[PDB]
Amino acid sequence: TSTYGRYGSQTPMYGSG
Amino acid sequence: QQPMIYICGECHTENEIKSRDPIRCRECGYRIMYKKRTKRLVVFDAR
Amino acid sequence: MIIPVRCFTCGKIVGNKWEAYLGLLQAEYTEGDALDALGLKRYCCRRMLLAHVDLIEKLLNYAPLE
Amino acid sequence: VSLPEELNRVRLSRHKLERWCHMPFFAKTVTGCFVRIGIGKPVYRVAEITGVVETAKVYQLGGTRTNKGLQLRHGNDQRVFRLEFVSNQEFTESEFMKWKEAMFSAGMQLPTLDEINKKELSIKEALNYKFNDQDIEEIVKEKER
Ligand SMILES: [Zn+2]
Ligand SMILES: [Zn+2]
């Protein structure tokens, strides 16, 4: 239980906002 | 590498308690808290 | 606590009749005319639904979360 | 350091910040590691965790929420950052060489590999840290806020 990403959870961008 | 997870009373949030810890919730502050179900095999006879 | 599945004496399925029977009583049926509109003839099967007290509605008030 | 693989040991992923949103000594463990922050379209740059700043924007990261910032900088382009745009992706080759060129282009010395080796263990000691002091209390005060 250290980094269970399996990618990821849709990392939001900085230039998207 | 299993940290012995508890469920709070008033919060219902899983906390990690290792030994030598205060039993308190990681939020809201609660001194009562319960344990999670087992992982072993529960098999009943519908009887 | 929750409606038994079967009549203890007979064997007949009464588990599917608690909602229908509370709905008929809400409509206007008298309690003896609701019990045979559901199709319960023997008085063995009829006490399952008259005598039943529903506690699970009170036990559901104690939410674990929310 | 000439390798994006050793650089990933001190690469801070997204699943590790959530555990230390309220652990103190924060400006002492994370300052010296490298994160994979997002710019946006799938391009990324290796920015430098410089200081611990706070935003007036409280945003939720999954279940947890955190309004803090990160003083990141890619060589010379430095600005504020939030904790949601970081990538769980490891240091690739093109981004490792891009960061190498941004550091050779800025005049910043590349941190010696022994520094990374002495920095990566700070994380593992901070993870197995026994919270016997009064950190639970400030943690709950910081979570309720
Ligand atoms: Zn507590
Ligand atoms: Zn019967």
Side-chain angles (χ1 to χ4, degrees), chain B residues 23-29 31, chain D residues 140:
Chain B
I23 276 100
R24 284 203 66 192
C25 192
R26 298 287 102 87
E27 78 190 69
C28 100
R31 302 301 162 96
Chain D
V140 311

Side-chain angles (χ1 to χ4, degrees), chain C:
Chain C
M1 276 201 265
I2 185 176
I3 189 70
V5 180
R6 317 211 183 199
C7 168
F8 301 136
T9 304
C10 165
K12 186 174 158 65
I13 283 87
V14 310
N16 41 352
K17 319 213 145 75
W18 178 245
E19 311 301 351
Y21 162 87
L22 293 168
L24 267 52
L25 265 62
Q26 211 274 343
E28 45 80 15
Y29 279 121
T30 188
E31 191 174 357
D33 276 335
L35 279 162
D36 37 10
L38 296 163
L40 297 186
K41 301 291 100 177
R42 286 174 282 266
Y43 65 99
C44 76
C45 297
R46 286 192 152 215
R47 98 243 181 243
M48 303 296 304
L49 284 179
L50 293 159
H52 175 67
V53 68
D54 212 349
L55 284 163
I56 209 171
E57 306 297 324
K58 281 269 196 68
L59 269 57
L60 283 192
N61 272 1
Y62 295 113
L65 63 100
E66 283 97 2

Side-chain angles (χ1 to χ4, degrees), chain D residues 8-145:
Chain D
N8 282 309
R9 321 165 187 173
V10 289
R11 185 190 70 86
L12 321 185
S13 278
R14 202 172 39 194
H15 301 83
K16 296 194 285 184
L17 63 92
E18 314 154 8
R19 299 183 287 107
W20 286 310
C21 313
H22 305 285
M23 187 90 217
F25 282 159
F26 195 90
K28 187 171 70 174
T29 304
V30 314
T31 60
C33 280
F34 306 126
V35 289
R36 184 163 183 168
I37 205 75
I39 300 93
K41 185 49 199 56
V43 68
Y44 288 103
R45 285 168 186 170
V46 196
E48 270 73 54
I49 296 145
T50 40
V52 48
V53 306
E54 183 257 354
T55 82
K57 307 181 172 185
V58 197
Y59 50 95
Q60 301 207 331
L61 189 58
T64 171
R65 66 195 316 174
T66 33
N67 73 320
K68 306 192 196 198
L70 183 44
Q71 213 39 61
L72 283 182
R73 166 181 165 180
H74 188 71
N76 313 273
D77 195 0
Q78 62 85 30
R79 60 208 163 280
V80 72
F81 289 92
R82 294 159 204 82
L83 286 65
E84 47 191 2
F85 312 127
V86 72
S87 304
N88 289 298
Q89 295 283 341
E90 271 205 348
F91 292 146
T92 49
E93 292 64 42
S94 89
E95 200 188 358
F96 185 72
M97 319 312 127
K98 180 54 204 61
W99 169 79
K100 292 295 190 183
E101 289 144 11
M103 300 321 123
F104 265 126
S105 62
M108 184 203 89
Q109 64 88 32
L110 288 177
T112 302
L113 188 38
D114 57 3
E115 202 273 348
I116 308 195
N117 313 337
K118 68 93 174 179
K119 192 55 167 182
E120 56 206 22
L121 200 39
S122 74
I123 329 291
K124 197 50 189 205
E125 56 87 11
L127 185 147
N128 289 147
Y129 167 64
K130 286 314 301 193
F131 319 103
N132 311 138
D133 60 69
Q134 293 294 106
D135 60 9
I136 311 101
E137 305 78 349
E138 55 102 23
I139 276 167
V140 311
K141 299 148 200 173
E142 283 166 20
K143 272 193 179 73
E144 55 83 16
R145 168 65 184 86

